[PDB]
Amino acid sequence: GLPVCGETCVGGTCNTPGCTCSWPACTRN
Numbered sequence: 001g002l003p004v005c006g007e008t009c010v011g012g013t014c015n016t017p018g019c020t021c022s023w024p025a026c027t028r029n
Contacts, residue, residue, distance in 0.1 A: 001029045 005019035005026035014026035021027075 001027055003027050 003025040005016045005028055007014050007016045007026035008024055009021035009026050010024045012021055014021050016026055019026040019028050
């Protein structure tokens, strides 16, 4: 739920394990 991944996902995918794309920011929980 929170953008604490230090990653953006404009292309729609996150590479940081445990993080997922809440477009356009990677979020964890």
